[PDB]
Every structure is written in structure tokens, then in C-alpha cells.
């Protein structure tokens, strides 16, 4: 394949580094060694995390077209339009966002806290509506495209996660390259990574950039939309969009893309009592935390998957950390005694 | 002087990222050249900031001796207790916090968000309220061996030493750059951040060019804070020279109305840089520290062509407990 | 039966008016005539509601032994609890408050707004979380004398004695109108309140008038403690009958989706009578018995001409709990 | 004076009772004797209070004109406007009030919990402005084909909003009547002045206008007394009072206030704990908790003649508590 024909803006450090979690490991049983990729420390930019990777790929283009404007939507604590927020005052583009309640949740602070007080500090136009608005079947998505240009200006549309767009799975390939490129100096490789998967273009990206050396099937995505159908078709379709543009030689199989559905529940943004304890294990092994919507999950995920043996022992399993972070705001209640 | 005798240990990523303000710079005039080290983004430990640099330095000791449980203070939203939570849980041992409303403020979810709300994930022991020797003393009879951490890291002999190395990573980066800053922006409380600064630059005749930023919003005391860490700091990293007053810079024109609490210019500036670079700053400290940056610049106070550094110390977590005030940016 | 038995402590301002919800009534047809006896007007301390008419018939027990604190349970948006605890304050009695969190529901200031927060400024020891025989005993223990009240006031030997009387009072009041109500429509969790109706409504041949609305979301258990507590009762005030299975209605359709959880249709009502009367209903309680009420009109449930007397039995402080549900209306 | 001159819709349930604090007297000595009022609990629309007292007289007049509109205005956790928009819920009329940030407090849901949060419920369409709005909103009403009833900020500055504690005085003439006795004092907390008002003028009645004991707690002393005073001989003019309002009848104590309107001091939530724990009776940290606290210091000091009988009028206003959660989090 070929990734470098397409343009990377800088919008990060660098590439992440990978630590081992040798405490959690031990805690474990030993058996099984995790490491983490810290995505979630990847920019300057508001926390960055996952999406200003992918955003890397997105901005090239949105510079060269004319566009003054950078348009994204998301839930209430969507990390995703808080990055797009910080990386438009960065480059010096207005933003305006599309928000709506994306969960059956209702904390007393969850619309001005965490993520969301963010963008608006950050200077987006952040568009929250009413319960009962309905944005996508509204279709307020493209109200708000039409609403900037009608303003005067050129709007760049980025959508849910960033994921659904042609770009959108290219910085994830860069991130196989990476893993690649740091393996050579641990003289390994890991034999598993685990991913956090929604809106798909993380773990399809990630596909794309494994497939290349025969380890897809390897990207264990542990689903958090509890539409693990509607997701895992959206990974797969993604990929293989993505595999054609960098020009993978290769079909994307059924079997290549792994989406683990039981750490899911109960629904997109609300943790169980397994992500809870997850989130706690994590944070009191090893200094780093998670959140209960996407990394906590995943968290749970691996380390159930380790308890459980489905790890062959002596394996080294890469745990990439997403961000998000600062969505912890609006679930204080949860650990208001940790 | 001799800073590579005392052990450091790695908590942080290594040496922090300096990035250019091009945005804020060209928003101001352009007649001078600002910069912002990162010190908000070297740890992977909730967050990090300048009191993870910090720590390096203390943790060695408190291995050496048979520590088993990390022992700290702060207000409410304390960014201290928060890395030293952090730190213990990596580092594998207990935490007891000492949490008290230094501040005349009183949000809903204060005690809730933010920097604590990580705390007690992280698992430390969170005491609200001497509490202090209460809190150590707890310690040992509960059969433990505390390693006590004063308010921010600086009343403590190795309090300064973190930011002498982060002078010494100055010059490096400099080197590498092809050129040097002629001023760093430090926003400045308990003094060992600033200390530390000043010992580092009086190695090669800065000190005097570290410009702190007051957000104690009692300047004398932290004024005199600062100095006394620095000449004690000298001391324990053999520096040449005796630290003079003159080699401690404090403006205090940026600290109202309360440690604690933002003032409008504060609101403003954290708004502002923010909004041209996507940088965020607190209300509490960097808010405060940026606001005296720019109101400098713009006052012209700066001589033209000027290369300033701004030390982004981190805080960002306690914009939660400030939600209403920015409830519409 | 002779309740006049038994003493009442005065803790309420005497009986409770009944208005007539004329406009909801237009409203929804003008089929049905809808009023409302205001049990959640019935007290100068703190709010009151229904457990404070249920309060009084309790009150001379503790105070025939020698009590000298209350000790009650509830969830953490307990109106019993906050009841108890300004019923304490006025008797000049202790209180200790087992408040556990009942309902699957998390909210910032879920546990410092509303009831549980009265009930700590009335001066209650709130202990968060068998807890309950915990705290009897640890008032023992601490040298004083403690009187149980169950949750809800409901199943203890007087705890249907108050809606007896209600239903005593509600006869005195018809024949001050010279009419009669066909229906009473009352939100039932722990039972003693309907149980008390059901009694009192016996008396006169209507137990099956009173239309109970289940909130609990466990009607089979509640079903179960309202019949309990019935016959209990009908055998303390002297009632010459059985209580039978057709004597107790309860609507399961409103419950819905949980304890302590509204549905859309509870919002929808309780914006509905607000909006319509200026009285205001909570999620967790009389949003449901209201919304009920509605739907049964709605549904021609009730004959046409029928007068009904909707109990409004309190909670509306909890609806601070639940502020992010109604930021918008 | 003839009161029943004008109207007055019923918008509460009748007299409002007056109870014995004993155990808050005792605690204090004994040498005075307190009770209070209960304004707090005069209405079932949405808890009312002393603004609702008030109402009563104004919307007869709103009836008569063809208003179908009631358009108020108050700070983020007035009382007022959450009156306002129960009365026009309960009387079938639209409601749009002026919000505005009038406290220097800035609590994370402040504009959510209490009073606030209750108007919005009731259907008002609250208007909140980003940290003249006053006549969009009246215009916004006759544009959209409505008629406005303008009610002023407390009800206070306007013809008819004195009217409501005449009656006060009224109605404790009738108690008192029954008890054998007369009060010899009366504290009541003011800010924008017609309650205090109306009870100057009522009590000016047989003489004990200077008994009313107004508890400023706007911060504003100056200003708040003299709008006492106008509104007072305004309020004596309409009803036919046989005495003109002296500048001493009108009776404000300025050392509870501070630090200012809004926000409570430690003695303020100290004699909020102090009489919710000797009487269950709460009170809020913005008015009632610093009237209070004036009585309670009052009572302290010995300025009150041993053997007096003081009345509380409890204004009502609990429901802001929610909006300072965190100074209560642990009582
Ligand atoms: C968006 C996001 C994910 C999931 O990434 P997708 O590409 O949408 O599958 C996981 N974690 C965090 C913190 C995110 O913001
Ligand atoms: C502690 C702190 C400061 C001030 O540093 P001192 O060494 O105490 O003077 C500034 N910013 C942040 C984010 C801090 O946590
Ligand atoms: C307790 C309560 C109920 C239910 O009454 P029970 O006697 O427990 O069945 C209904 N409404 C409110 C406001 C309550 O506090
Ligand atoms: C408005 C109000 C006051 C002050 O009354 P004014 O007539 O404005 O002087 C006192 N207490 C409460 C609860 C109020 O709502």
C-alpha cells in the first residue's frame, strides 16, 4: 500500500508511546503481558486523543479547498466536536457544532461540563438542541452546512467520529505503520491489539494498516454502541473503502475485522458495573484512566479476556488508548467515593 | 552547578514540547515571539503538569527510605494531590490526601469534578476536612511509612529541583532551535516552580528574566517563598553564585480577586488564547498567567522582537468545578 | 370503627383543602370532574405531605415510651425522611436518617439538593450507606432512646390510622359541599396510605373507589402491603368486615420504567397539570398518580359526571433532583 | 382605610397561621417571646409566599384590562417570577419573565434547581440573557397578538402592589382579636419594599408602624428605605389612611444584609440551621435566613423589652436553597 501519497497536517507530537502496564499485568496472573498506546496523549490541542489523529488526514484537504469553517455534530460529550473545536481555533477556522443527547443519561451538569464546556471555551458555535429535536432526522447536519455558506463562509464537513469519510480511516493505516516501525526496536510483536470501536474508522483504519503484514485479524475491537451489528458493518465497509484508497493488495475478509459484543451494555454511553470496576482497576494499578463511555469499556474487555484465558499465555497484548478522558465530568455521581 | 546528583526519577515522557503561538502572536501586534512549553502535556499520569516534574525528584527518596503510602495537601481542586494520586497508584503504594477549601467559592459539583474526581478514582484515601500531622500520623499506626509532600512540592528541600532541569532542557532545546528565549512566563503560587527556574537561568545570567506571574493574590509571601527555595535550591545543586532578590521577578498585577478566583481579564485571556491557539488554560493559574503574558505584550512592555516562553504548567481539569461561569464560552 | 381511639399528635395545619382542577378538567373533555385535596399543603415543616398526616397517629407512641430520637430509612429523595426529620426538629427529638440509594438513577447533586438536603440543614444525622437495626442500635448504645419508623411509615401497627382519617375528613368535607366524590386516585409505594383509605373508605361502602396507582414498579409486592396494612388496620379501628381482594385497586400501567424513574408520559403530566392548574407533581411519585389520572379521563375510564378527588400526597422537592430532565420545560 | 375597595382574587387558601417558635425563645433566653407568620404556606400554587399575597390584588386589574399575558421580571432565583408563573398557569394566561443575573454567585445549577427550574415547568417562557429586555418582552407579547399585564420586580413599584400586606395587618388585627393580645413587634426581610410597605401602612393603623422591624437584604439600605417610604404613603393615599406616613414609621435594620443581595453570610447560615433545628422551620439563604438572623440578634442584644411579643413573617423562598447546595452539603 501507499499511505504517503496522501498529506498529513501536524496536529499532533509526534508518534505515542507505548508503556507496559506491568502492574496491571501481574495483577492478572502474570500470564498475560499488557502494554497501552497512548493515543490519549497525542496533541496539545484540548487532550486530543483518537480523532485528531484521523484529523490529521481531513485538514489537508479542508486547506485545500477554501474552506473557513470546520462543521462536525456529536452527542453532549462527544470528544470527537471537542477536538474539531480546539484543531479550528489552531488552524484559525470558525466551528460550528451540532449537538443533541445521544444517550439515556440526564446529569445535572453533563451539558457544561467535561468536553462540551471545552468547545465552547474553545470558541465553536456549539448548537445543542432540545430534547425531542431529533438533528438526524431533522437532518440539521446539513441546515448547519447550508447556515455557514449562506453566512459567507466555506464550510468543511466532517461527520460523526470523523469515520464515514473518505479520509476518515487513513490516519489509523498511519497508526499500524507506527506499531510496525516501534516493534522493530522491542525486537517483538505484540500478538494482539485492542481497540474501542463506534463509530468504526479507528479499528477500520487499524485493519487496513495490519492487513498489510497479515495480522487484521489480530485488532481485537471490543464494540461500546451496543449496535454491534451496525457496527461491525461499518468497520468492515469502512475498511475496505480505506484498503482501496491507501491500495491494499489484498480483500478485506468477513474474518478480518474482530468485534468482541460483550462489553457493550447497556447502551452507548452508559458504563456497567464491569466498566466501573475496569475504569477503577486500571487507575489503581497503573496512574492511568479511563472513561465509562469508550476506553472503560475496552479496559473491561481485555482484562475480562485475560481472567478468562482467551489470551494464550506468554502473549503481549497492545491496549490503544483513545482519549475521552475528560467525559468523566459528566458521571460524577458514579464515583463521587471513586 | 551539579543538578545530575540527584536521581530522577521517570514519571513524564521526557523533555516537554515547545510549540510557537504564531495565532496569539499575530493577534497581539506581532512585535514580539511567543511560545509555550508544555509541561500540561509530559505525563501520561492523570494528565500531568509541572508538579510531576516535580516529583521526579522526590520520589527517589521516599523509595530510598521504606515508603509505602504518598502523603500530600491541597485545596479542593488541588492539581497536586491529583499527580501525586497518580503517582502512587503507578509507583504501587497507598495515598492520603488532605483536601480543604482554600478558596472562597462554593459550586455545586466543587468537590465532585475535576482534579479530586480523579483522586479517588485513582484510588487515594480523600480527606475532606493540623489536619497535616493527623494525616501522617494516621499513617504509621495504621502500620505504614509515610513519605510527607508538602503544598505543591515546595517547602521541601527537594522541591526545586525539578525545575532546575527544566532550565538545563531550555538551553538543550535552544541549542537545537539555534536560538534563546529572552523571557519565560511562570505562573507562580507555592514558589518551587518558579525557584526552580530562577536557580536553572542565574546559571547563565537569566534569572532575572524569568517573569513570574502571581496568582496567589499574596505576593509577599509568595514572593519571599520563591526566594528562600531558590537560595535553598542553589545551595543543594552548588550554584556559583548566592540568589539575590533581584533574581526574583513577580508581577502581581494579575492575581485578583482571590487565590482561587478568576477575575474578567482572566476570563478573557483564557478565552482568547484558547480561541487563536486551542491551547486552554485554567482559572485558577494558567488563566492568570496568560492574562499577565498578554496584557505585557500589549502594554508593550516586551521590547520589540522579543522571544517569549510562556511555562503552561497544566490545571486544565479544574475548569469543571467552574462550569457556570463558561456556561456560554 | 372509632379511630377516635386512638391520639394524634397535631403536626399539620388541620384539614386539607380540596380544590377543583376545572381547567384540566376542560381540558380533557369536560367528561370528568377532577379536583385535588392537597395533603402536600398540609404542614409548616419543611414541605410536609402524607407521611405527615401519617406522623401524628405515631408521634404520641415514641413520646408515651420515652423516645428522644426518630430513626427512619429511605432512599436518598426520601420525603418520609425529610418529614421525620423536621417532625424531630419540632419535637425537640434526635434523628438518624438511613438513607441508601434506591434508584438507578445518577445526578451530580442527586444527594445535596431537595429532601436530603432540608433533612441535613433540620439538623438529621444522614448516614449513606442491615444498616437499619445498625443505626437503633448505635443510638442505644450512644445513651438515648429510639423510636423505628419503617419506610414510609407503612407497615407498623399505626401506620394506617392517619388515611383512616382521611377518609373521615374527606366525609366531613362532602357534607360541606353536599356533594360526594366517586373516585379518590392515590399514588401507592409502601401501602399505608391506601391502606388507611381503603379502612376508611370501607367505613361507608366505597373501598373500591379508591383507585390506587402503583409506583413502586413491583405491583405484586405492593399490591401485597396495601392489603397487609389494610386488614392490620380494619382490625385496629374496629371495622366490621374482611378486607378482601376487590376492596384493593391498584394501576400497574403507571410505573413504569422504574422506581424513582419517570417515562415520557409521567413528564408529559406533569407538565400538562402544571401548566393547566399551577400545581406542580414530581418524577418519582405524584407524576405518576397523576399521569394516571389523566389517562384513565382520557381513556373514558371514568363514567361520565364522575367527580374525582385526586390525592396530591407532596414530593415535588425532589424534583431538583432531576434537574437536567426539565432544563428546557 | 377601606381596603375593600379593591378587589382581591383568590390565589391562597385563606388567613395565614401564626405559630409559637417556644424552643427557639427558650433557646434564646426566654425573655422574648417569638412566633411567625406562615406567608410561606398561604397558596398551593407552586409553595407561593408573600409575592402571591400580593398578586391577588393586581390580577383583578389584569382581568379587567383584556391582558392575557402576565410578564414579570427577577434575578436567576427570584421567587416572584416562579409566583407569577403559577398564577398564570392557574388562571389560564401566558407568562414570560426576565431573568437576569442579580447575584454575583455563579453555582453550577443555579438556573436549573428551585425556583427557576419550577417556572419553566409551569410553562413560562423564561428568558435568560448570556452572563431593553424588559420591553422586548412586553412588545414580543403584543406582537405576537397578546395583551401584557406588566408586574414590576417584586410586585413592589406599582399602584396596586402595597395592597396585599395592608391586609396582612388586617388579618393579624383579627387574630390578635382572638388571642387577647398585640403583637408588640413584627420583623420582615425587604428588598424591594411594598411588603414592608403595605405593613407600615396597615399597622400606621393604630399605631404601630414603627413596630414593623424591616430587615434589609438588598445591601442597598439607602435606596431600599426610601422605596419603603414612597411606596408606604403611595399605598396610605389608595386606601384612605387617617395618618400620613412619618419618615420614622418606616422602621430598616442594614447589619443583616451583607455582603450582598444574594449572598448569605455565616451569621445568616447559622440562624438558618439554628431555627430549622429548634422548630423545623426553614428558612433561605437570600432573604428569610438573613431576617432571621436580624430577629435572633435582635433577641440576643436585648434591644427587644423583655416580655415582648414579636411576630416573623416568614416570606417563604426555601425553594432557592437548592441553588446553594454545597455551603449545606453537610447541614
Ligand atoms: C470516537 C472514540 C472512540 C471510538 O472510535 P471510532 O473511530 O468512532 O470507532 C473510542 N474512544 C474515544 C475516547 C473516542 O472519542
Ligand atoms: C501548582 C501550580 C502552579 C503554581 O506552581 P508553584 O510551584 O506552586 O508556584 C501553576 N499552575 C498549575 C497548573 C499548578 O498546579
Ligand atoms: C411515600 C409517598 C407516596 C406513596 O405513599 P405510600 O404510603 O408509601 O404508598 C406517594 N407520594 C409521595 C409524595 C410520597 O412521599
Ligand atoms: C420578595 C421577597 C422578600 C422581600 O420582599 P419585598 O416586598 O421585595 O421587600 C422576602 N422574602 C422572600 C421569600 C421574597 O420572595
Avoid at 119 to 139: H, K, M, Y
Avoid at 150 to 174: E, M, Q, T
Wanted: net charge neutral.
Amino acid at each position: 500500500m501507499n499511505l504517503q501519497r496522501f498529506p498529513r497536517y501536524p496536529l499532533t507530537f509526534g508518534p505515542t508511546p507505548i508503556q507496559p502496564l506491568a502492574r496491571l499485568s501481574k495483577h492478572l496472573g502474570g500470564k498475560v503481558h499488557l502494554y497501552a498506546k497512548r493515543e490519549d496523549c497525542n496533541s496539545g490541542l484540548a487532550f486530543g486523543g483518537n480523532k485528531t489523529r484521523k484529523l490529521e488526514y481531513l485538514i489537508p484537504e479542508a486547506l485545500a479547498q477554501g474552506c473557513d469553517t470546520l462543521v462536525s455534530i456529536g452527542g453532549i460529550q462527544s470528544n470527537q466536536t471537542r477536538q474539531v473545536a480546539a484543531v479550528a481555533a489552531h488552524l484559525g477556522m470558525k466551528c460550528v457544532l451540532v449537538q443533541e443527547n445521544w444517550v439515556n443519561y440526564s446529569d445535572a451538569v453533563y451539558d457544561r461540563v467535561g468536553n462540551i464546556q471545552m468547545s465552547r471555551i474553545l470558541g465553536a458555535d456549539v448548537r445543542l438542541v432540545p430534547d425531542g429535536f431529533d438533528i438526524g432526522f431533522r437532518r440539521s447536519w446539513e441546515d448547519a452546512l447550508e447556515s455557514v455558506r449562506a453566512a459567507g463562509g466555506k464550510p468543511y464537513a466532517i461527520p460523526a467520529g470523523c469515520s464515514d469519510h473518505p479520509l476518515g480511516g487513513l490516519g489509523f493505516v498511519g497508526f499500524a505503520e507506527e506499531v510496525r516501525a516501534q516493534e522493530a526496536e522491542l525486537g517483538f510483536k505484540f500478538d494482539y491489539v485492542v481497540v474501542c470501536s463506534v463509530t468504526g474508522s479507528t479499528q477500520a483504519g487499524m485493519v487496513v494498516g495490519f492487513a498489510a503484514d497479515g495480522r487484521a485479524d489480530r485488532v481485537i475491537g471490543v464494540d461500546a454502541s451496543a449496535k454491534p451489528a451496525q457496527t461491525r458493518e461499518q468497520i468492515t465497509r469502512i475498511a475496505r473503502q480505506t484498503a482501496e484508497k491507501v491500495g491494499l493488495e489484498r480483500d478485506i475478509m468477513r474474518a478480518d475485522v474482530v468485534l468482541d459484543e460483550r462489553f457493550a451494555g447497556p447502551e452507548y454511553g452508559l458504563p456497567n458495573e464491569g466498566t466501573l470496576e475496569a475504569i477503577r482497576l486500571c487507575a489503581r494499578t497503573e496512574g492511568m484512566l479511563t472513561d465509562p463511555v469508550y476506553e472503560g469499556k475496552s479496559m473491561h474487555g481485555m482484562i475480562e479476556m485475560v481472567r478468562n484465558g482467551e489470551f494464550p499465555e506468554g502473549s503481549r497484548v497492545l491496549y490503544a488508548h483513545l482519549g475521552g478522558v475528560p467525559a468523566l465530568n459528566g458521571y460524577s455521581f458514579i464515583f463521587r467515593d471513586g
